[PDB]
Design a protein around this ligand. Structure first.
Ligand SMILES: Nc1ncnc2c1ncn2[C@@H]1O[C@H](COP(=O)(O)OP(=O)(O)OP(=O)(O)O)[C@@H](O)[C@H]1O
Ligand SMILES: Nc1ncnc2c1ncn2[C@@H]1O[C@H](COP(=O)(O)OP(=O)(O)OP(=O)(O)O)[C@@H](O)[C@H]1O
Ligand code: NA
Ligand code: NA
Lengths: 228, 50, 220, 224
RNA sequence: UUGAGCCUUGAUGUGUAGGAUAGGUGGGAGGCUUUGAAGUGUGGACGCCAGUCUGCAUGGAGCCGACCUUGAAAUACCACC
C-alpha cells in the first residue's frame, strides 16, 4: 500500500493538482483517467520516485518491488533488445554484475571469497538461475524471436519494441506502474493478449491507458485526475 | 494574500529555520540563500521547505 | 494399497508425542530400504522478505549417515587441508573444468579465500541443486580442510522454503529412539538460536516426522 | 475541445502523385510488389494493416525521407505537403521554447499574433508559451504538430497516425477539422471509427496482395 | 437456498528446446509391480481438446528412475505448504 501524503506538483503559474492524498493498494487494480497535459504523466513519475513533488511524500513500502518501465521507445535506440531486457529485478541485476567480477577481476582477496560466497547465495535466493528462463519465456511469449534477440534497439518495429520492453516490467513484479499501453496502436489481438495475462496474473497495477474498451476489459478502480 | 508564507530550513542538519514570503506563481524554485546558522554559528545554505 | 491402509492405520488430525511417534515411524517400515527418517518444522517467517530467510548448518553428534565427497576448492593451504582431512577434489579450476566437467558432481564444496575459481566456474552446473559454498554456512571460511572434516562428522545444512518451512533428514531409522531424540533436540536448539531477530509472532507452529515410504505424524 | 481547422493556401486541380512502382522491401521479400495508383486530387485513402506491414516506410518513401529502390513518385509542382510523422522526437530538440518553435514556421506572419493565438486556440496559455517545448508530453506534442500543419496550410497532409495520444475530446476536434478540410490527404491511422468516419479510398496493404479502393470501408469490412 | 472463516479427504496445476498438459522444496538414482500387474472391452470428471484423473472384474503379472531435449527434473516417491 503506497500512500500519497499531500502530494502537490506545480509547473509555472498554475499547479497541476493540489492536496493529493490517496492510499493506493489493496488487491484491486487501479487505472487513472485525465486530459493529457494534466498530471497523469507526472503523477506516476512522482509515485515511482523519479521526480519528487513540490510538497508531499511517496511513503513507499520497503520491499514490495515497485515495477517501472521506460515508456517511450523512440529515444533509447542504443541499448539492444537483450540489453534492455536484461537491465526489473534491480537487486538481481546488481548481484549478477557484482558476481561477474570473478571472470573479470584477475584475482581475489580473503574477504572477497566471503563476498562471492554470499553473492551467489543471494543470486540463488532471488533465483538468478531461472532468471534467464523466465526472461526468455516472456520475450518469446510477447512475440519476438531468438533471431531478433541480439539485434539493435532501432532496427525493429515499435509494434514489437513494446512487446520486448513489456518484459522488463513483468519480472514477477507486484505493484507495477504501466504507462500508456495503447499509443503506437497495437493490433487489438496483442491488446487482448495483454488484457488476458494481466487479468490472470495477480498484482497491483496502475495504468494510464487511453482506450475505453481496453480499460473496460482490464481494470477495476478508476482514478479521475480531472478537476484538481 | 497572493504571496504565500514559506520557510527556509537549514542544511547544517540543525533545526533552525528562517521564514519569509514568496510569490507562489512565478516559477516554483527552492530558494537558495546563504544565511547565518546560530546553532553551529556559521554561514550555511538554507534550502526552502515547508 | 499402502495409502488406503495407512490413512486408516494412522490418523494425522490428532497430535502425537516424541515417545509414540518414533515407535510408530519404526513400526511403518513398509519398504525394503534404509528409510532415512526426516523432520519438517513449519517455521513462522516472512520468507517473502529476505532478512527472515533462515540458512544454516549444524553439527549433529551422530553423523549424516552418508559419504561426504567434500572437494576442498582452495589452492595451496586449502588443498593441503583437503589432503590432510581426505579431500576428494584438489583446489583448482581444473577439477571443475576438465575433471568436474566430465565428472557428474561432488557432495560438498569447501571454499577457501586463496584459490577459489569455482566462484565463477561452478555457475549453474554444480550450484543448481544447492552445492555452492555458502559463506553463511561456513563455505568461505579460514579453514577449508577443517570444514571438510567437520562436514563428515554430521554437518547437515538447512534452508527455509518459499513458504517458511524447514525439512531435512533427522537420521537413519536404523538409529535408536534416544539418538533420534537427541539429534532432534540439537537441531531444534540450533534453529531456535538461528531464528531472525525481526520475526514477529510465534515462529514454530508444527513439527512433523515422516518416513521415506511411510506416512508422517505430528511430533508435538 | 481545441479549435483546429486546416485551411488551404492554394488549390490543386488535376492530381497529386501518380505513383507507378517502388519495389521497396528493406531486407526480406518486398511487402508490396507493384502499387500503381493515382489520386485525381482524391481524399483519405486510409492505409491499414497489422503491426509490421509497412505503412510508415511507404509514407516515408512517398514524401522523401527515403526513396524507392526502383521507380519514381513525383508530386504536382505547385503542391505543399504537411507531415505528421510517425515519430516526432527528431523535431522537438535543440532547446526551443513553445513560442520560438511555433514561430520558426510561418510564411508571412506576425511574431505576436497568428503565432500567439494559434497557440491559444488549442488549450495553451501565457504560462505555456514560455516553457521549453521539449518537456511537453504526448497530446501536447500532437497538438503542436497540428498547429504547425495549420500554420503551414498545406495542400496534402500525410499525417501518419494522428489519433496516437489524443484526448478523445481532441479526437472529435480532429475529426471535425478533417471533414471540413477541402484539400488532399493520406493517412494510415489504425483507429476503427476514424477511417470509418472519413476514409473512402482504402489502400489495404498486405505482404502478398494489396487492395485498392474496395469502397467506403464498410463493404470492405463486411466482405472480409 | 446463498455469502464467510476453520478442519479433513480427494482432486488441480505445458511450453517454446520436445518422449510427456515437466510447482518448488533435494533426502535419495533404486524403488514401484501379484493385501493380482502391462493393455485389451466399458463408463465417468475436467481441459490453451494434444491430453490428466477415476468404480470395474478380467486379461494374469509388466511398467519405471536414469540415460534425456535441460533454468529444473522427471507423479521411483514419502512427507509440509
Ligand atoms: N520539466 C518540465 N518543465 C516544465 N513544464 C513541464 C515539465 N514536465 C512537464 N511539464 C508540463 O506540465 C504539464 C503536465 O503534463 P504531463 O506530462 O504531466 O501530462 P501527461 O498526463 O503525461 O500527458 P498526456 O496528456 O500527453 O497523456 C504539461 O503542461 C507539461 O507540458
Ligand atoms: N527499419 C525497419 N526494419 C525492419 N522492418 C521494418 C523497418 N521499418 C519498417 N519495417 C517493416 O515494415 C512494415 C510496415 O511498416 P510500418 O512501420 O508502417 O508498420 P506498421 O506496424 O503497420 O505501422 P506503425 O506501427 O508504424 O503504425 C512493418 O510491419 C515492419 O515489418
Ligand atoms: Na501521458
Ligand atoms: Na506505419
Amino acid at each position: 500500500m503506497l500512500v500519497s501524503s499531500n502530494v502537490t506538483m506545480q509547473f509555472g503559474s498554475k499547479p497541476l493538482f493540489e492536496n493529493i492524498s490517496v492510499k493506493f493498494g489493496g488487491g484491486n487494480r487501479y487505472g487513472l483517467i485525465g486530459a493529457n497535459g494534466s498530471g497523469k504523466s507526472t503523477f506516476m513519475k512522482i509515485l515511482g520516485g523519479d521526480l519528487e513533488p513540490t510538497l508531499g511524500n511517496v511513503s513507499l513500502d520497503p520491499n514490495e518491488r515497485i515495477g517501472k518501465l521506460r515508456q517511450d521507445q523512440f529515444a533509447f535506440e542504443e541499448f539492444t533488445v537483450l540489453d534492455t531486457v536484461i537491465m526489473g529485478h534491480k537487486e538481481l541485476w546488481e548481484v549478477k554484475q557484482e558476481r561477474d567480477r570473478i571472470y573479470a577481476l584477475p584475482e581475489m582477496s580473503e574477504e572477497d571469497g566471503y563476498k562471492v560466497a554470499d553473492l551467489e547465495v543471494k543470486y540463488g535466493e532471488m533465483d538468478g538461475y531461472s532468471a534467464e528462463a523466465r526472461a526468455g519465456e516472456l520475450l518469446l511469449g510477447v512475440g519476438i524471436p531468438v533471431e531478433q534477440h541480439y539485434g539493435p534497439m532501432s532496427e525493429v518495429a515499435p509494434g514489437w519494441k513494446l512487446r520486448v520492453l513489456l518484459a522488463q516490467a513483468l519480472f514477477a513484479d507486484p505493484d507495477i506502474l504501466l504507462l500508456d499501453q495503447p499509443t503506437n496502436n497495437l493490433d487489438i489481438d496483442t491488446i487482448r493478449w495483454l488484457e488476458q495475462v494481466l487479468n490472470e496474473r495477480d498484482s497491483t497495477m496502475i495504468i494510464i491507458s487511453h482506450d475505453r474498451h481496453f480499460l473496460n476489459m482490464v481494470c477495476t478502480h478508476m482514478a479521475d485526475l480531472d478537476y484538481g | 494574500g497572493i504571496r504565500e508564507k514559506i520557510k527556509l530550513v537549514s542544511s547544517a542538519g540543525t533545526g533552525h529555520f528562517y521564514t519569509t514570503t514568496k510569490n507562489k506563481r512565478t516559477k516554483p524554485e527552492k530558494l537558495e540563500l546563504k544565511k547565518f546558522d546560530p546553532v553551529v554559528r556559521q554561514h550555511v545554505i538554507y534550502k526552502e521547505a515547508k | 494399497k499402502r495409502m488406503r491402509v495407512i490413512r486408516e492405520k494412522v490418523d494425522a488430525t490428532k497430535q502425537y508425542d516424541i515417545n509414540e511417534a518414533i515407535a510408530l515411524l519404526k513400526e511403518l517400515a513398509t519398504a525394503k530400504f534404509v528409510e532415512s527418517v526426516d523432520v519438517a518444522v513449519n517455521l513462522g517467517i516472512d520468507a517473502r522478505k529476505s532478512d527472515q530467510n533462515v540458512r544454516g548448518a549444524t553439527v549433529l553428534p551422530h553423523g549424516t549417515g552418508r559419504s561426504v565427497r567434500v572437494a576442498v576448492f582452495t589452492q595451496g593451504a586449502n588443498a593441503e587441508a583437503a589432503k590432510a582431512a581426505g579431500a576428494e577434489l584438489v583446489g583448482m579450476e581444473d577439477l571443475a573444468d576438465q575433471i568436474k566437467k566430465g565428472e557428474m558432481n561432488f557432495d560438498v564444496v569447501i571454499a577457501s579465500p586463496d584459490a577459489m575459481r569455482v566462484v565463477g566456474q561452478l555457475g549453474q552446473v554444480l550450484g543448481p541443486r544447492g552445492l555452492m559454498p555458502n559463506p553463511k554456512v561456513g563455505t568461505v571460511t579460514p579453514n577449508v580442510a577443517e570444514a571438510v572434516k567437520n562436514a563428515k562428522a554430521g554437518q547437515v545444512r538447512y534452508r527455509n522454503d518459499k513458504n517458511g518451512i524447514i525439512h531435512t533428514t533427522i537420521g537413519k531409522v536404523d538409529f535408536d529412539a534416544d539418538k533420534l531424540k537427541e539429534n532432534l533436540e540439537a537441531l531444534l536448539v540450533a534453529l531456535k538460536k538461528a531464528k531472525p531477530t525481526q520475526a514477529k509472532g510465534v515462529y514454530i507452529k508444527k513439527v512433523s516426522i515422516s518416513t521415506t515410504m511411510g506416512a508422517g505424524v505430528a511430533v508435538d | 475541445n481545441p479549435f483546429i481547422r486546416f485551411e488551404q493556401d492554394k488549390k490543386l486541380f488535376r492530381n497529386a502523385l501518380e505513383v507507378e512502382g517502388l519495389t521497396k522491401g528493406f531486407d526480406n521479400g518486398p511487402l508490396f510488389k507493384n502499387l500503381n495508383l493515382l489520386l485525381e486530387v482524391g481524399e483519405k485513402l486510409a492505409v491499414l494493416g497489422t503491426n509490421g506491414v509497412g505503412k510508415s516506410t511507404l509514407l516515408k518513401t512517398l514524401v522523401g525521407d527515403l526513396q524507392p529502390d526502383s521507380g519514381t513518385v513525383k508530386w504536382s509542382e505547385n503542391a505543399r505537403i504537411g507531415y505528421y510523422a510517425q515519430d516526432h522526437e527528431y523535431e522537438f530538440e535543440n532547446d526551443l521554447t513553445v513560442f520560438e518553435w511555433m514561430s520558426q514556421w510561418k510564411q508571412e506572419g506576425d511574431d505576436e499574433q497568428a503565432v500567439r493565438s494559434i497557440l491559444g486556440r488549442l488549450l495553451f496559455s501565457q504560462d505555456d508559451i514560455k516553457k521549453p517545448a521539449k518537456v511537453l508530453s504526448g497530446g501536447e506534442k500532437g497538438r503542436m504538430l497540428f498547429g504547425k500543419l495549420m500554420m503551414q496550410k498545406p495542400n496534402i497532409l500525410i499525417m501518419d497516425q494522428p489519433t496516437n495520444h489524443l484526448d478523445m475530446e481532441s479526437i472529435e476536434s480532429l475529426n471535425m477539422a478533417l471533414e471540413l478540410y477541402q484539400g488532399t490527404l493520406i493517412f494510415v491511422s489504425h483507429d476503427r471509427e476514424f477511417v470509418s468516419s472519413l476514409a473512402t479510398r482504402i489502400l489495404e496493404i498486405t505482404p502478398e496482395r494489396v487492395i485498392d479502393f474496395s469502397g467506403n470501408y464498410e463493404d470492405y469490412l463486411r466482405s472480409k
